[PDB]
UniProtKB/TrEMBL annotation, chain D:
Interacts with spike glycoprotein E1. Processing of the precursor of protein E3/E2 into E2 and E3 results in a heterodimer of the spike glycoproteins E2 and E1. Spike at virion surface are constituted of a trimer of E2-E1 heterodimers. Interacts with 6K protein. Interacts with host MXRA8; this interaction mediates virus entry. The interaction involves 2 adjacent E2-E1 heterodimers. This is Structural polyprotein. The gene is SP. It comes from Chikungunya virus. Acts as a viroporin that participates in virus glycoprotein processing and transport to the plasma membrane, cell permeabilization and budding of viral particles. Disrupts the calcium homeostasis of the cell, probably at the endoplasmic reticulum level. This leads to cytoplasmic calcium elevation. Because of its lipophilic properties, the 6K protein is postulated to influence the selection of lipids that interact with the transmembrane domains of the glycoproteins, which, in turn, affects the deformability of the bilayer required for the extreme curvature that occurs as budding proceeds. The chain holds residues 859 to 1200 of 1248 of the full protein. It is found in: Host Golgi apparatus, Host trans-Golgi network; Host cell membrane; Host cytoplasm; Host endoplasmic reticulum.
Amino acid sequence: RVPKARNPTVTYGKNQVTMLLYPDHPTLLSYRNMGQEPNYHEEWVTHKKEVTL
Amino acid sequence: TLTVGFTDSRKISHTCTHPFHHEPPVIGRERFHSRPQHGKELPCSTYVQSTAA
Amino acid sequence: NFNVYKATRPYLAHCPDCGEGHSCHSPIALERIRNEATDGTLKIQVSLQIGIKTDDSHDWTKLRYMDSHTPADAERAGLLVRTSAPCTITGTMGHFILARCPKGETLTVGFTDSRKISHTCTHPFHHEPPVIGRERFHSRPQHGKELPCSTYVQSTAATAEEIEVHMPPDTPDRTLMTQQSGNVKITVNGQTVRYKCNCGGSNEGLTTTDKVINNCKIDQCHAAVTNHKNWQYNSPLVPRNAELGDRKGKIHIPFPLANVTCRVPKARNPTVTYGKNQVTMLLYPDHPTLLSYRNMGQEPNYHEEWVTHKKEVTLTVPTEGLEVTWGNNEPYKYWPQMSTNGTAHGHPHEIILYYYELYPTMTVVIV
Amino acid sequence: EYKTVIPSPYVKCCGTAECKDKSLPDYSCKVFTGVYPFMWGGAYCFCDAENTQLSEAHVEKSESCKTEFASAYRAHTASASAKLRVLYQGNNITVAAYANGDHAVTVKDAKFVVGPMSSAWTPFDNKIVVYKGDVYNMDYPPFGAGRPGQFGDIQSRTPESKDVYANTQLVLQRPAAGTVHVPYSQAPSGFKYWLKERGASLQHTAPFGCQIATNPVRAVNCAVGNIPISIDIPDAAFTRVVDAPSVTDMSCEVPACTHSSDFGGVAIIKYTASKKGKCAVHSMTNAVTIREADVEVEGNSQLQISFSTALASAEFRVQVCSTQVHCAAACHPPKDHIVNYP
Ligand SMILES: *[C@@H]1O[C@H](CO)[C@@H](O)[C@H](O)[C@H]1NC(C)=O
């Protein structure tokens, strides 16, 4: 077994998303584009980071 | 480090130790340290109690 | 003598961890952790009772536990809790224990049975005492300042903090059954048991006497003893009785909250060296501590850093003064005095130094 | 901080449950099907997949609120009170009064009026949030619109009021197969968290360093503006000029002086007077100050006075017994560049 993660709280903006994340323990967050270009990113999180995409 | 110890019929404590860095591998992105009541299930290698190799 | 738990009973619930990775059912299931106290002491709710016997005494020697749908008494001494190292128990009453435990991330409890068995459970609960004051201290001092902080108390009489207790639904166990040449035999041994089988004939029935249903497989169906004598206090794990939400029977939670003073260490007084309108403070942390400085004028010039090693820091005083706060010690104020003796009035002018050291950049561009 | 109440889940076999709305804060419910829970003695019930599970939960205030909490106020204006020490008839006397130009205080037959404060500036702000002993300038969200994971996530009118407001996205989940339990997606408490990222208190961020206290909340010892003081002094303290001894043959000298934050200047004056008696001393130039207020004069004698200046060369008059004496000297810079006392 492996735990899930606290579902983040997402706020809004013009073509922009502001996801606030509660780790509750060291956890990984990654994002990537849906097109031919990845725009890969992957960070480690241990505190509540409010991130914008 | 890693030490072992035992008590003799001599009523003596015999102990030995070796420096061995024991780091459980983080399985999945969520670096979890105690498995949950609720969560996903993933494969992972492990041992068994069988006594016939 | 704070005796309200006559009809209570312990659980035997699915603990998340019975040890060695697999999760099983234990009598020491825990489902509530309270850590709002600033001091760091924690309430721990626990499934089984403590401080009582089957006869409803109040000696702390024993505690009550469920097993085989029957109560039993076991020594209180063997109870223990851990996060990273053995912790310290202070509260022992009903279903709540007051414990203080050093910095730890998980939290397990364990006890020894009259079965001479060790039953243990654990939950991952990140326990981080809040740093009170700037000086991040880990063991309170012989000498130091005193600050308020929330904490608990040993009182055993609460004020309107009620928890409901309801009649246990049932415990469906098939050990009572046994196959007698295709004839299932159900044994009651002195309880109220509802049997219900898909088999025809007496498919359903509540009885208190040993019964037999012939010409039917034991795996055909299940039966459950319907206990409704001593009430069981509500928990998410336990299933509901399936009639409604609440049931009569309420108990108060002891160990209330109050805030009291607690000690906090001072900080090594730094050694200060000197310079032209400049101060060089060398700091000995002795542990993680905060150092901040701010101007005395309408502009703050705020700064606040964390320090854990000896940093030698330099500050440039403004004409209006500067105050620095170090740890929880009283802040030190430094404001400039005239700069230098280098300037002097005499046959060689030496006034440019006067008007530079005092009012630099002013009365000099005037020249 | 809030407490999440989740009573024992409703289990059922061969039948289905139903959600009935509850008029409770953030109350939530859900149902699931096909769950086959197992207990210690075996399966709870036989219906392999016809069984159902109903769960529900809500959130309430914690009894700890009665002791620990954070309170948001909308303080806007303020009033000023102050303490003064006055040297009257050769003794220090303490006075206390509202520094707003209204309060008048009588002491030792004299009427003192203080204020109003020249500057209306304050270190506070229209909206403030207070912990047990700390104050913060911070714009809290409007009541009833708390953002989860942030300050104000739970709103209560008073520590004792039963009514509350909450916003915690309490969503349930399907229970783990083979087990009886209730999962909850309880929102993490933003209140406890805000205590973790409080930041610097206003006692450090306040310009002019106005020390801040509580119960009641006050801002103290900040230097801004000036104060007007009106003193009505009965004539009893006043002494007719004839009463005061005369003064003559006034000479001044400065063996040495040192412009500094302290009374680094020393001046010796030779004086001759009619008779023994007290006499006030003053400097009529603001560039220099004198520590002493008055002095006894016997006649053809001398005296010493300690004063502070800032001019490189100190050239000033001094008034005593309604007479003026010149004083000229050349001070020198001290060695220290910075001092602690103000
Ligand atoms: C008034 O205060 C000063 C401050 O140090 C003190 O020296 C003096 O003795 C006090 N009393 C007087 C001046 O009568």
